[PDB]
Amino acid sequence: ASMKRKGVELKDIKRCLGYHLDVSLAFSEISVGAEFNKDDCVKRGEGRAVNITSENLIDDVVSLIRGGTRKYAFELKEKLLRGTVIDVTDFVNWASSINDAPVLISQKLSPIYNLVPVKMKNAHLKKQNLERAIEDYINEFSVRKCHTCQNGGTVILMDGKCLCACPFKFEGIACEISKQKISEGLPALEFP
Amino acid sequence: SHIDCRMSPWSEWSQCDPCLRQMFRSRSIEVFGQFNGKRCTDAVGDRRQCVPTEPCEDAEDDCGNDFQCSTGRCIKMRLRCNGDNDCGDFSDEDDCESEPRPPCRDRVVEESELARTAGYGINILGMDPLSTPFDNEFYNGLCNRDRDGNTLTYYRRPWNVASLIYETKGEKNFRTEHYEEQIEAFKSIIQEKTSNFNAAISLKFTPSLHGKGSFRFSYSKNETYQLFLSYSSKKEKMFLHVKGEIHLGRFVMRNRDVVLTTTFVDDIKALPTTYEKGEYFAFLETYGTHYSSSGSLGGLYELIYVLDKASMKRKGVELKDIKRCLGYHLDVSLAFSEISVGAEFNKDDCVKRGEGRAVNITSENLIDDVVSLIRGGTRKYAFELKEKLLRGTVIDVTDFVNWASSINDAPVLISQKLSPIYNLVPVKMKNAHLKKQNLERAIEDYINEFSVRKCHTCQNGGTVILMDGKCLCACPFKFEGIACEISKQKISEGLPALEFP
Ligand SMILES: *[C@@H]1O[C@H](CO)[C@@H](O[C@@H]2O[C@H](CO)[C@@H](O)[C@H](O)[C@H]2NC(C)=O)[C@H](O)[C@H]1NC(C)=O
Ligand SMILES: *[C@@H]1O[C@H](CO)[C@@H](O[C@@H]2O[C@H](CO)[C@@H](O)[C@H](O)[C@H]2NC(C)=O)[C@H](O)[C@H]1NC(C)=O
Ligand SMILES: *[C@@H]1O[C@H](CO)[C@@H](O)[C@H](O)[C@H]1NC(C)=O
Ligand SMILES: *[C@@H]1O[C@H](CO)[C@@H](O)[C@H](O)[C@H]1NC(C)=O
């Protein structure tokens, strides 16, 4: 983001006045003269300039990886992040490493109370009891019951701490302070 | 301010405990001291020997069920000579008349340096978690397989630990931003004035008689004024924070039906029941305030640094010039028949004025703050990552694998689910219930007794901390140190006075 604003003002005024008075009177042997001249000029000047530039930049990078042995996994991570040169053997090493140690990708889900063994002591009543328990668990505490953050900050819940992820252009906790304050300008005369 | 510690409110002597043989002279903490004055770490509590007067008939029987151990615990159903280590190395295996029947035939390696030590006593007002307040080696019956992990190896899960996962979760974030501010102002003012005057009059008379006279007068004046003013200021700010964690494993301690260690059991057995805050405050610092219901082995690292820029420029120029001049001419000539009279008077006077003023003042301010931290793994591979991360700009591929292996060798807590201690006390004990509510009141009085809430507030919004009595306040970046009194930003001083010598 960038912003540029320019304003220039110039003012000049000149005003002048001119006056001439001449009177001459003549007797037979009498002579009278008079000469009055007036001159006055006035000049005015004013100048104004405004030059204000503003620029804003925002960058966010995130990345993650998982699976395989610790040696071959992070060897791919170091060369992937701003490496720009991917190898042919490192991917085969990563494949062998993840063959040695895989991890979950996609998971189809199923409730636990359907897994309880049948024809047990009190299987059925315990089944519906654990169903009510899991319902009360999933509807008891979550982001739904916590408080909403500011500026549309996505609220998370990490073991009691009900923090909210604030957007990029905004500052941290509680999303209160903006972090973008319109530049302040004071054209006042310096005191000392 | 040399703030002293008003920290001696004394209480009355309570009744002597006959079984414990201790007295309860009580006390309380009131004032810490926010400034560099007298530090006061005086602990609350006092003990005294007392002659017991009650017969102390209350005692803990040996569970009336089965073979008593050498420390106070009991076999439930199968804690006999079956390779089940509960009390000591050979304490439970003291005498074995039957054959040493192994509990499990498969080869399962013991939990080496892993979450086996799952007990943690983190202090919400203190620091990093504590050690295990309970025994975590005891197991009840048939081995529960833990067929998971990086390599092909089988670990054991104790009966006290309800669950343990080997999920190698890992995430990290990045962020950055930019702020920009600029202002400029130009001003120019000019004035011009000119004044001129004329005055000429002549008089002559001739009707011998003759007369002649002439007056002349002039005037000159101009005053030019000039003004110039300029203003400029620029500001820039950059703030960003990043963090990453390498999760190793997660465990969830079983809440109830929990076995305890001999030392903690002995401490709970030798424990008062008349609300002895003095001994309870010691027990709290000894075994933490509340234990961990679930932890997260691994390690995290994060680096932050901050940038701030400020600039100011002010310019003012003034020029003043004035010229004024005067002119006068007088000439009179008189003529007789043979008589001649003359007169000539001339006057000239000019005046000039000059003045100049200039103002040129530049100011610039910069603020930078950088912080970073790391933990976990062996000391060799951990700080080898730290040196190359800090301003290295070239991350290796092998160093991260070395860090992964190092943190696999030695992990550390990342996320910790919390649980109060008074829920961990064993049930059906001597005075378990009353001791339970007593320790609950004790932990409540601990968490509400001394904290930043009771200390004094700092200045300029300085975040106040408490590090073992010293109630210091973290002052902002643009401000100076302790007590946040001196600003550290003083408006530049300017003196245009004439030099004395
Ligand atoms: C406002 O004034 C600044 C003065 O820095 C202008 O930036 C350029 O500055 C250089 C050197 O100072 C001059 O040689 C250029 O002529 C200036 N550019 C222009 C277009 O005059 C800036 O461009 C001006 N305008 C704004 C909106 O900031
Ligand atoms: C005030 O005066 C200083 C004088 O240093 C100005 O800085 C520049 O200085 C160099 C060498 O001294 C001159 O050649 C430049 O002409 C000066 N700049 C300008 C714009 O005249 C400074 O810029 C002046 N103004 C302020 C606000 O400090
Ligand atoms: C006198 O008159 C002339 C001509 O009008 C003018 O230019 C001048 O300013 C006047 N004043 C003087 C010479 O002081
Ligand atoms: C005003 O007088 C000053 C003094 O020398 C001169 O430099 C300037 O040119 C004069 N201005 C006008 C408009 O006559």
Author numbering:
A (entry chain V): 344 to 535
B (entry chain W): 18 to 224, 242 to 535
Paste lines from the article.
The multiprotein membrane attack complex is a bactericidal weapon of the innate immune system that also modulates inflammation and proliferation when formed on self-cells. MAC assembles from soluble complement proteins in an obligate sequential pathway. Based on structural similarity with bacterial homologs, the giant (110 Å diameter) β-barrel pore is formed when helical bundles in the Membrane Attack Complex-Perforin (MACPF) domains transform into transmembrane β-hairpins (TMH), although a molecular mechanism for how this occurs is not currently understood.
The open conformation is characterized by a 30 Å wide chasm that runs the length of the complex. The hinge region of the open conformation was resolved to 4.9 Å. Masked refinement from signal-subtracted images followed by sub-volume averaging was used to resolve the averaged C9 monomer from the open conformation at 4.4 Å.
